[PDB]
Amino acid sequence: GSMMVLDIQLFRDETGANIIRESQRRRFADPDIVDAIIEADKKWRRTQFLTEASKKLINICSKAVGAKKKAKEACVLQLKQLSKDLSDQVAGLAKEAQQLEEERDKLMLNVGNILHESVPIAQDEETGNTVVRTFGNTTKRAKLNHVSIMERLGMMDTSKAVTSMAGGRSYVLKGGLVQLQVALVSYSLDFLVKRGYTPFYPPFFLNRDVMGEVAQLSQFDEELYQVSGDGDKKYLIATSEMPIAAYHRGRWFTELKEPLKYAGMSTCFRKEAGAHGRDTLGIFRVHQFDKIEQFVVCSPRQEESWRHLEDMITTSEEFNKSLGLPYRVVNICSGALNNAAAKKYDLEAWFPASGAFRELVSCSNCTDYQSQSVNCRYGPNLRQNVKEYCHMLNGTLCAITRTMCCICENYQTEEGVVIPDVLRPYMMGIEMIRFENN
């Protein structure tokens, strides 16, 4: 059943419907769908209006019979029949209500979050993404790519010894690379703790019902493994953003003078159904990887979320600067944005052997898209004419395997890989991991 889509409230006002139509056109999506959603919703509201009315009339029938029969009268027989009929009508109204919600929500799958005014308008990323900032020597060239380096270290196995055990794109890390992996986890966690984030270690399973509130329906198809055996069926998490968002379901923050900031720490599991033969090379694109994630829950007011988005990307930049990895920050074009995001920044690191900018980090302001889906409310209650929801953002701090790949290319020498200065105290003071002699 459950699925994550845009708030219905914005559709029920002429000005809001026009905001959504405009955002649809700017995303290269269908604006005509907004009318279809308003109509389905108008029918749905009608069923709810009749249901609330008829329920009140069911008590009228009950109280009437209670007063009449206490008065010792032999119309009661009619009132009883009318109670059964209204209960029948309410039952019929509910089945119709259900069908209409299903139709509405399925139409809404095609409606994205309202674009920020700064999002570039383009359908294609190569031409369409706008470069915001660059850091370091982004034209640097180096000898060996990350796959060759990790193979020459003797510290990564992606051969049939592993894939015949664990399937395609599975890998073993050994020795110095595991030390580096752990160094990055711990350094990444500390980096965020120092910036006011609360560490958060989630369950790696979510139930279907809950996963449906924080995942787009296409993610079930392309990205989420199903887990079974123990009670209800579950899904492995693709990112700690899922359980962190789900953790706020049904919550209500009367105010958030300070944001909630979490440093999500987890293994991430991705089926990568789309990537038939994209990579297959190294640990750059794998089904299982550690990631440290920024997650922010904040007030929906005064565009505070937009300020946090800037802080979050700046945080990921400062992290990569600390590692000395060259990069560019790009503002993702409207055609490439997922539905939840109102704006997205990617930090794409320069891979000097490979000769390419490759995404290490994405940071998104999802405003009230997830929040309305998980029902994470904000402010005072209606009983204020609008229901307010918290804003939520999420952004990579460090995706560990891709960052390891970038470090290997950028810090290679003839003898091995130099460990970035900041990571050394997190791996026993090791200055370099060395190639197998030949």
Ligand X SMILES: Nc1ncnc2c1ncn2[C@@H]1O[C@H](COP(=O)(O)OP(=O)(O)OP(=O)(O)O)[C@@H](O)[C@H]1O
Element (H, E) at 337: none
259 binds a copy of itself (CB under 8 A): no
Q: Is 361 annotated as a binding residue?
A: yes
Distance, in Å, from the CA atom of 190 to the CA atom of 208, rounded to the nearest integer, reads 33
Name which of 103 and 125 has its Cβ closer to ligand X: 125
Is residue 302 at the binding interface for Na ion, with CB under 5 A as the rule? no
Q: What whole-number distance in Å separates Cα of residue 237 and Cα of residue 290?
A: 12
Strand 391-399 with 288-298, pairing: antiparallel
Q: Which positions from 282 through 321 interact with a copy of itself, judged by CB under 8 A?
A: 287-288
Cβ atoms < 10 Å from Cβ of 126: 7
- Assess 47 for contact with ligand X (CB under 6 A): no
* Contact by Cβ (8 Å): 420, 323: yes
* Cα atoms in the 13 Å half-sphere on the side-chain side of 429: 0
Binding of residue 141 to Na ion (CB under 5 A): no
Burial class, 134, CB count within 10 angstroms (exposed 0-12 / middle 13-18 / buried 19+): middle
Query: Rule CB under 8 A: is residue 164 a binding residue for a copy of itself?
Result: yes
Instruction: Tell me how far apart the alpha carbons of residues 409 and 325 are, in angstroms, rounded to a whole number.
Output: 10
Please identify which residue in the block is written with the tokens 């787009």. Answer: 216
Q: Confirm if 374 and 214 have CB atoms less than 8 A apart.
A: yes
Nearest-approach distance from CB 182 to a copy of itself, in angstroms: 5
Residue 9 or 138 having the CB closest to Na ion: 138
User: Between residues 236 and 363, which has the closer beta carbon with respect to a copy of itself?
Assistant: 236
Q: Which stretch binds a copy of itself (CB under 8 A): 90-98, 116-124, 168-176, 351-359?
A: 168-176
Check binding of 215 to a copy of itself (CB under 8 A).
Answer: no
Binding string, residues 112-151; x marks residues near a copy of itself by CB under 8 A:
----------------------------------------
Taking CB within 5 to 8 Å according to partner kind, which of a copy of itself, ligand X, Na ion, none is near residue 289? Answer: ligand X
Query: What is the C-alpha separation between 156 and 159, in angstroms, rounded?
Result: 9
Alpha-carbon distance of 186 to 67, in angstroms, equals 73
Of the pair 90, 292, the CB lying nearest ligand X is at 292
Say how far residue 89 (Cα) sits from the centre of its chain. Answer: 40
How many Cβ atoms sit within 10 Å of the Cβ of residue 386?
A: 11
Q: Rule CB under 5 A: say whether 137 interacts with Na ion.
A: yes
Instruction: Name the DSSP class of 424.
Output: G
Our CB check for Na ion shows the closer of 137 and 267 to be 137
For ligand X, give the closer residue by CB, 291 or 343: 291
Tell me how far, at minimum, the Cβ of 226 lies from ligand X, in Å: 18
Spell out, one character per residue from 202 to 241, where the chain touches ligand X: x when CB under 6 A holds, - when not.
-------------------------------------x--
Nearest CA to 215 out of 223, 205, 226, 227 is that of 223
If contact means CB under 5 to 8 A according to the sort of partner, which of a copy of itself, ligand X, Na ion, none does residue 164 touch?
a copy of itself
| Residue 15 assigned to a binding site | no
Q: Which stretch binds ligand X (CB under 6 A): 51-59, 148-156, 205-213, 399-407?
A: 399-407
Nearer to ligand X, 260 or 332 (CB): 332
Q: Would you count residue 172 as binding a copy of itself (CB under 8 A)?
A: yes
Nearest to 393 by CA among 371, 360, 361: 371
Q: Is 139 in the site for Na ion (CB under 5 A)?
A: yes
293 assigned binding-site residue: yes
**Rounded CA separation 311/416 (Å):** 35
b/e map 261-278, b = 16+ CB within 10 Å? bbbbbbebbbbeeeeeee
Handedness of CA 274, 278, 283, 285 (dihedral sign): negative
What residue type is 138 in one-letter code?
T
Alpha carbons 229 and 412: distance in angstroms, whole number: 45
Could you give the CA distance from residue 10 to residue 209 in angstroms, rounded to a whole number? 24
- CB of 136 vs Na ion, minimal distance in Å: 8
Please state the residue numbers annotated as binding site: 239, 270-272, 286-289, 293, 344, 359-362, 394
What residues are designated binding site for L-serine? 239, 270, 293, 394
Binding site for a copy of itself (CB under 8 A): 161-162, 164-168, 170-175, 177-179, 181-183, 185-186, 189-190, 193, 198-207, 210, 224-232, 234, 236, 243, 246-247, 249, 263, 265, 267, 269, 271-273, 287-288, 426, 428
- Judged by the rule CB under 6 A, the positions of this chain that interact with ligand X are 239, 270, 272, 285-286, 289, 291, 338, 344, 346, 359-362, 396, 399, 401-402
